[PDB]
Amino acid sequence: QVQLQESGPAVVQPSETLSLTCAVSGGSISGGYGWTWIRQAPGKALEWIGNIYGHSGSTNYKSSLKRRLTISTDTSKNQFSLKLTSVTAADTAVYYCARWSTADFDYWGQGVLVTVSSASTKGPSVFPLAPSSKSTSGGTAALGCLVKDYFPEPVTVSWNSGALTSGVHTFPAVLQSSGLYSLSSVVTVPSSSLGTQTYICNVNHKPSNTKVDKRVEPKSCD
Amino acid sequence: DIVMTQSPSSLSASVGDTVTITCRASQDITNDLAWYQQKPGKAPKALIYYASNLESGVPSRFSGSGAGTDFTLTISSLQPEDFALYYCQQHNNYPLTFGPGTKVDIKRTVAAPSVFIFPPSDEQLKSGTASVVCLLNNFYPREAKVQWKVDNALQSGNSQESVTEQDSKDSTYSLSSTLTLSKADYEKHKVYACEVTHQGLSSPVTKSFNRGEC
């Protein structure tokens, strides 16, 4: 049946042009359907970018993007495509191609993540999140590691070479305004174990071939 | 542009329940309203069109209704694969617009967050930036608000948040909030505080530290 597949680059430098193509099979790109680009930015609702209609060639655009956007079809490859110029950090998102047919989007691509960043490959700095002396009063201590300023995804975090799994929460990474990623990994343990057990986070970032082990030391006032 | 809103932001459900979620349009859109389901890492899938028509290949336990400005999606006899995000979408007029989404949750009893605050580490402070971190651990439901206050001045635009998926073994969420300042600005203030609003708290709770006091 009808299948859509996005392709395009994963990283676009700020102010460069983002280019994507959707290859359509099981149906002609010249059919009377609305070939549509939609995107979803981190933690945001789906946003309709625009469309081109296969048979008439009519293009509908989001007003704020109209000076930067061109949508088109290629009948020799049965494709449609998206070009968006002068790209900024607001343009980082998962991009979907989709087919509008009368009353819903009945076929969708898989999505392709596009990230706007001028960063090169870089391993993280790893900073301890030690429990404050005060914070241990209730009998549970929260400790962790802040893994900051790396690119691209992903990093892996384990605790004590994987012997510590209970109570571990590793948060999804967020892209900072700098174009570099940052995440935190935390674990709660008993307060009484802060003087006996050693707590080390092991961070691996394969794209930069970096392995960091960070000992997380309890704070002491006296 | 037509603004779509959705209610609730998340809905607590158990397998076998019948649940209803709500969509509202800022103008009369008659019946040009569709509903979609999205699961983590996957593209959205159409469920309902023309407010009430079941899309092909979609289980009949999905139904919908409404005309004009208010619309409902109902799931009867909820199945495990139905815990997901749900979006409405108007097509009455260009600027096709979607709602913010409703997440259907695994129901559990309310759990207030445990709040912890971390000053920047010594090593980072040597680097030249400062990250203050506020952790909200093991709470439910998902809606939580974190505000940063530096010497009782409410911060804005210099923090980012991150939330886990619903925990597989106890059904809770956790959230980190990271306040980023330059070193020079961080060293101009004393009291760093995050304030947490959540349904399981009678009143917003504050966790703070004073710079240079252990």
Author numbering:
A (entry chain H): 1 to 222
B (entry chain L): 1 to 214
What text appears in the publication on this structure?
The HIV-1 envelope glycoprotein (Env) is the sole target for neutralizing antibody (NAb) responses. Here, we describe a detailed characterization of neutralizing and non-neutralizing mAbs isolated from two rhesus macaques (RMs) previously immunized with the BG505 SOSIP.664 trimer. We therefore selected three Fabs (RM20J, RM20F, and RM20E1) that bound to different epitopes for high-resolution structural determination.
We solved a 2.3 Å crystal structure of unliganded RM20J Fab and a 3.9 Å cryoEM structure of RM20J Fab bound to the BG505 SOSIP Env trimer. The CDR-H1 and CDR-H2 make contact with the C2 region of gp120 including residues N289 and T290. When compared to 10A, a previously characterized 241/289 glycan hole targeting NAb isolated from a BG505 SOSIP.664-immunized rabbit, RM20J binds to an epitope biased more towards 289 and away from 241 in the 241/289 glycan hole, revealing subtle differences in the recognition of the epitope. Despite binding to the BG505 SOSIP trimer with high affinity, RM20J was not able to neutralize the autologous BG505.T332N pseudovirus.
